[PDB]
Subunit: 497 residues, 4 copies
Amino acid sequence: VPDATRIGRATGAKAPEFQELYDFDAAALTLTSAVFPYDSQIHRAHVVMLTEQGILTVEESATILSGLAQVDELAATDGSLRTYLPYEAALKRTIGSVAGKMHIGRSRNDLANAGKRMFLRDQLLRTIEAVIGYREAVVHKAADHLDTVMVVYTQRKEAQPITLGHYLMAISENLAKNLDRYRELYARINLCPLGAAATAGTGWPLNRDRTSALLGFDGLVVNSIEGVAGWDHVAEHAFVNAVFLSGLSRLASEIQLWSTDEYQVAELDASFAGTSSIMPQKKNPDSLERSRKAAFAAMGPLVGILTSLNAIEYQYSAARVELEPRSIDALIAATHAMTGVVRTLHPNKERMRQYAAENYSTMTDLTDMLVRRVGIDYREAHEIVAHVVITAIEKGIKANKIGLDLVQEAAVAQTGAGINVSADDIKDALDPWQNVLRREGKGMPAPMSVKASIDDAMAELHKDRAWLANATQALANAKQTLADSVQQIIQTDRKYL
Amino acid sequence: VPDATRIGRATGAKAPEFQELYDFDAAALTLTSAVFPYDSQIHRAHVVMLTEQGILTVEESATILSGLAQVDELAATDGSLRTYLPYEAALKRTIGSVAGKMHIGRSRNDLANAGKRMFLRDQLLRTIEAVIGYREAVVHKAADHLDTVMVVYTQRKEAQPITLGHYLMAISENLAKNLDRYRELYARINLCPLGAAATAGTGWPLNRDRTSALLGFDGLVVNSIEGVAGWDHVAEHAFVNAVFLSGLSRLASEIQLWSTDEYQVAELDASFAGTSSIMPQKKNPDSLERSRKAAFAAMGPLVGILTSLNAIEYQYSAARVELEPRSIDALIAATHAMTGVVRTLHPNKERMRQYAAENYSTMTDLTDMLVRRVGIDYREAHEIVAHVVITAIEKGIKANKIGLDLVQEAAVAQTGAGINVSADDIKDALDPWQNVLRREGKGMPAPMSVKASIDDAMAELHKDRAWLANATQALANAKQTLADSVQQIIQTDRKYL
Amino acid sequence: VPDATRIGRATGAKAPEFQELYDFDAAALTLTSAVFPYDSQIHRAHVVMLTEQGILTVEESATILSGLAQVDELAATDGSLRTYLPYEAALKRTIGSVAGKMHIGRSRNDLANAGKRMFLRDQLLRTIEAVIGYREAVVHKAADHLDTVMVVYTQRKEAQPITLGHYLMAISENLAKNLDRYRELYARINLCPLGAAATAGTGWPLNRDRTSALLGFDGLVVNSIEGVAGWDHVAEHAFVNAVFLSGLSRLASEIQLWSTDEYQVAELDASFAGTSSIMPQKKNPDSLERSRKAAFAAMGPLVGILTSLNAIEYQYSAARVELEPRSIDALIAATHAMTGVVRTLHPNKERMRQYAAENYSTMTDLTDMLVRRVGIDYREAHEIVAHVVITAIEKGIKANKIGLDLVQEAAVAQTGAGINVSADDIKDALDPWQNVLRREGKGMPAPMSVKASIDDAMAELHKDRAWLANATQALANAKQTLADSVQQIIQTDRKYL
Amino acid sequence: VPDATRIGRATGAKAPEFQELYDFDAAALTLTSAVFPYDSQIHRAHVVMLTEQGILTVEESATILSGLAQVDELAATDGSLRTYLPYEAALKRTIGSVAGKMHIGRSRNDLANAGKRMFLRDQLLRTIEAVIGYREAVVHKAADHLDTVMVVYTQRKEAQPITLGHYLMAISENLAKNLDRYRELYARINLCPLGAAATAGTGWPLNRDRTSALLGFDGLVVNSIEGVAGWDHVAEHAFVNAVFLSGLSRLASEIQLWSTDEYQVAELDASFAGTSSIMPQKKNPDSLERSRKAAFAAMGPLVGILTSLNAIEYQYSAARVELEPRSIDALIAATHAMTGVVRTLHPNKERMRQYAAENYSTMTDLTDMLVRRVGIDYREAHEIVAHVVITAIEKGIKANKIGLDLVQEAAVAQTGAGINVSADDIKDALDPWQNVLRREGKGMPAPMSVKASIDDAMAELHKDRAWLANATQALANAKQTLADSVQQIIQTDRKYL
Ligand SMILES: O=C(O)C[C@H](NCCN[C@@H](CC(=O)O)C(=O)O)C(=O)O
Ligand SMILES: O=C(O)C[C@H](NCCN[C@@H](CC(=O)O)C(=O)O)C(=O)O
Ligand SMILES: O=C(O)C[C@H](NCCN[C@@H](CC(=O)O)C(=O)O)C(=O)O
């Protein structure tokens, strides 16, 4: 059965990234179902630690660990086993009273705080991976468009000429700092609260560093109150999502204006556009607007979480608002969609060049030229070029048809004095590509400086990938350490005891 | 004329920190008036750079710099000179057409972005200084209360025994990570956008690194669009303020509950409390509630700023919302007030000990004891102690009057089986100080572990102060470099030219 | 399998209202699945209108209507048919090309705006029903507690004596105005945008008033742009939810303080409390804190929706954020939970009376008494009673043990003058029940005035129920009109054509 | 000294409404200074009531009232007298101990709640007046543009043809419902809490209805707790401001796109545009973007206020966030600015008509035409017209140059079948003015239906003005009643006592 929205001008299939924006809502897990796999990992890690600490015998531990695998299997289909106390009771029904001993020195409070960290931890690595691929697509696009001259806007008005690659590298610098945020946050998520128990620790001699290590954490939440009352990392995760998505919404809005029927300087790839059921001419930026929607929605969890922390004491509280999987899924779907929008965007290079040459964004360089040459104050040159533009628009003269006559008229009419400049001097000031080439300092649109930025961004992207690989592998290693420590306790009880 | 609110039970004067909460609103500068001193610094730094770059002569530059000092003096009383173009025109009226040349290679867009960074930069150091003193007061208080036994709450219900010092060190760990946020943000605020001009750079050969260095920045905002469109640091500044203040509100709320007529476990210092004009018995937590008010209000700028970024393209925009001085002033006033609240808080140590011994927070250790000794599942011990508590409350027996009889009744009535434990075994489980001493792992309330936390926090506080001192001095040095470079250009033109 | 959380002090089953707070998240529909039943109603209403307008023949219409029933049945299990274009294509696969004619003069834009209104419309009536039952429970509780003397707090400090019924009638007045909000909003939701088509109307001669009427609306969204661009009713719905829930959170917080181990003036019904897996003494206010959580979370949709409207033009937009079913379900679950909390709350009337008599909330009436009798300024009487309290607390004298001696000491020590008042005059001022009875003006706690409020609230509740019944029946009538008009078109084509 | 921003293309002076956006921040009062005039009115009204109730003698009252006038005069310059207790003490210093008697039966809590209502009350009438003039300007503009054909957009893409007047009447309908919100809110602000005293009423026999009436209120906040704890009207005021401004931001954004260099379909009046200090071509929409800024900022108070209510109990609290004067001033400045933007907007009627005729917004009517004539399903006609557009764009044929050949090609190439339609049949479908005229149902762009909307809006505007006039006069009357009652008490004590 075909995608019924792919009709008329909406040709082909939705891009996969584009379809993600339609799928994430229905597919999102509840927080309970997203967190409960991490609970099972904590039960094993905690039990292993109790066995290493002699709080449980190798035989008690082996019994418990074999039962966890059993109840985990029941929980795959019995949703009622995905919260702790029902899970513990099922373990009791499976292996007997020894079940209860897995909760020695532990509470639901530090179990939940830890388990949710492990969830957000994986979702932070998932996010960094998405943002990295988004930066990768932006920089790779920029490298193909060092010569694609076009205007930059301020206040939605044409400002000066630049290049598409220069613009995209603004986004790259935006994302580099957002990746810094996500990495700095990871250092605060990946702290282990286990061992705080309810909020006050316990008399049982737990090895907190061992449980943290077996679960992939890079350190402890030390104080036990902070272990169960700490929630700022949830707030912060919501914020970084919000602010990163605000930049994604601004790129989305920028491309949507580029691709208006009126600008006509870029077109969405067919695979990232839809159409109307009533208006056959529509090529609709559904991917852009659903991506912006995610950015706006991301405000919600941020405010909900912060409101809830402002509402309580510095205690464990069940009143605290969570960052939900469906919010993070929205972020990933939008980042993926915009990664593909950027990769496949089709700029109309000739119309871009047309505006830059015709619609007066080169007037700064005409002004700079009078100052640099005839050496008048920037404020008097400005009034002349301003009158040049006023007169040009009245007479219907595009900026690239402005000549020595008009600049002389304006100079005379505004100062009673002509100006010593050549027709060539003027034509060169109004050449939008020359406007670009003159702008060659750091971070300016001249190809040589943009390419420099690209080289630096490509080196940072390598650092970005290496950081992610390390973080990811550090978790895979602990997770395999834990799995092995579990098979040991179990397999020896079976064979030699 | 005396403070008319200091009547009846509101004895003495408001503490200075307490009074700050009443003064910051009326005293707050507008953003314009707060930023315009930093504009004047940029004019000099920019001019100095133009002179070093030979874009201005030592004589042109000296003229301009002497005029800046003149217009700066006019602006001290003429508020209309605190935005750029009126300021530039006054400079023109002062020194002539050469005035206009200070704007060579520059825009209002990168001037404003840079100037607001310099403002927030100083306000970030001001904030870190306040938070540091807040952490200093919290840790110093904790060190005096390692023996002050009291209950910790979860869900506003007594949970287990701890100490006041253990609690305060939860706050210390909260603030350590908030100081990390503020420091990580400083690295993104202290980037120089100057040289981006409108958004596209310029053909003038500016030395961007020189202007950044003369203005105290630690690096550039490289890409020129990012220089004027970048606003995430404003968003982030608002967030860190919001989340830090959320923790301050939770401490404020905690102390307000401690100091209810019903808890009666702490009392605000007279200098941090008010009273009623109608109810003479009132000792009102005005300092706490006005501090919470600041935390709630801090939500506003955060949402306003993020909404505005979600509303635009990735351009310069005058639609962007700012972080205002009056919001930061509120944060400082509240941090100062709560620093003083904590320093001067008066805990009722006997009532604290009373609750911990009488109101059943020791029941965990009774349960742990049955498991550790008679070696029953935690879930069956739990039902017995739960019935102990149920029976205890019915009969009016406080937890420290619970004895072997009652635990035997409960065990029998719940399992038909007695339990091998001594009267001493039970009295020791219900001793709340022994509850503390047994909780001696990392981050738990036992004095030895809390003291450990304190030693670590004191070492971190030293690192905190050293980071602040370095940041502050790095700005004082650039500011004196700049001042000297200005007096040079001026004094030599006068004497040798 | 029993509820594994019902252990120790958590006796019996969760109340149904209490369990609702655990069930709503997993059970919540997506917006798509919640809205698509209303889409099917619009297809019939629209078709019926086209048939009445002769845009379709009784035979074309009958074919279409019979097919809608068929595809509706397919959609019960095929989730992909719950968005329009896939639904339309299935109708085509069912009845042929005539399927497409149901979209004559219509768009997805006005279909969606209308369908979401019909969804929120039903959810508004559902909400008003919940709030009504919440007000019913509050007033009914108040009527049973006109004599339950207790203190009112300001700033979490005991202020003056009142009654529990007086307090609950503050909530009643809060809810009356929230019901006004919900009713005023209903008048703006129940406007029909159908006939706006994409945004500009259509050349087809639709009878817009007929479609509105067949779908239960009470009027049109007239202008066609406003029909598809209008979203303020979604914003407003989110706000009213937010502000109503803020009051519910304040009652929840109030009861949670009443029921602290320290206040001890109210206890949650066993069926609305939980306990700890580690701490057997816990009677945990899980119902209160999960209700507050809903209130905080309700901030999110409000901010998301408003951000999205601030981000666009006054057009149809797919970037707009929605009010989701899971948010409304949270509101209903919390309103139900707190309805049951209030109905079943157990106040400790003796401890309430104890505080009112012992903890100095009667000092206002002692002050008022000196002014009313010995006729001194309220400010000098205030200083004396304030010193009475200061001295009383030092010496350990509860307010009901304050006598003529102490008031004489304070008067002398503060003014060198005694005061002509009797031991009876003083004992009467400090009688907290007499404090209540003297407060007998409108809205004050004296039984006679509270009962007055109750009578008025009971009359308003009758108006509240009657408004709801009318609104609900007006929709049931249109829905049966529509069903009948459909069976007519279908059954006559079958028999007489 | 001239406005230094009025240079180059920024000709003439800023419009007054435009300048308002630059002035409101520095000029905004603090809440304290904005509310304290209303405090003085309450002192008189309260005293008058006490005198009518015989709680004060005509001589005591006359003394007090004469002193209020004296301290009010001191407060004009002594800012420390603008909070109650300092004010009361100054009254004591002026007229003696009788000063204190003005606080009989009263608190700072119900004084402040009432005084802030009186402030917001006046600011609500001020807002309704601004919004009315904004609607007046929108409707009056629409009446001049029934023939100004132009395209409507959905998703920032051209949708169908309409008229500028049709668009503006969408805004009118938006504002009508926002005026309903403001009026419904006024009924909840204009309730008098005075007589609640601290929260529990008083034993003094106050006539609450008299004080309410003397102060212009239309009813009581009955319950005394609700009188000091009630804050939802503050929340709601913030929301209505937020949602109304969200619509103003959407109009602002719409006009800013119209007036891009690329759309070129409208131009801001010179008096509502600025320019660049560096780019002489800029005509900058500073008025639009500063108006949007206000809309975004208005999110802040809304979230702050709601967070604070979610953070407390249902008590008086000093933690509650306020709606500040500077926020309301921003709203008024933005509403005024956009009122003037709309009044003076210059549409380019020829370019508007050009797009409507050339850029394919008429394709719906071509599709509708094939269905209405050759009588094919809307879905097959849609594919043909879609291919017409695809082919048209490839060959460079504007929609008004589409002819019978191209529609035949598309029909054949898509169905192997030609189509019986005339060249005239097609040219008429593609005539954008005929597209308008055919859209003549309710709320559609045809002149006759828009004019209908205008007539209805003009009648509503009359109702809007009459409601405002009544509300305003009802306050002026009470205020003069009060002034007269004061001069009576004073002038008779002087002459006959
Ligand atoms: O004073 C009373 O009549 C009643 C009393 N008011 C509590 C709040 N007092 C301060 C708060 C502040 O200084 O921020 C205020 O009235 O502004 C009470 O309820 O105890
Ligand atoms: O059901 C809920 O929403 C809350 C529930 N209990 C919260 C409190 N936990 C225990 C500690 C414990 O059970 O180990 C405590 O602090 O009293 C939950 O854990 O989800
Ligand atoms: O008045 C305002 O709110 C905005 C005003 N101008 C914004 C745009 N700036 C220029 C560049 C320039 O002037 O150097 C541009 O981008 O067109 C302001 O600068 O505050």
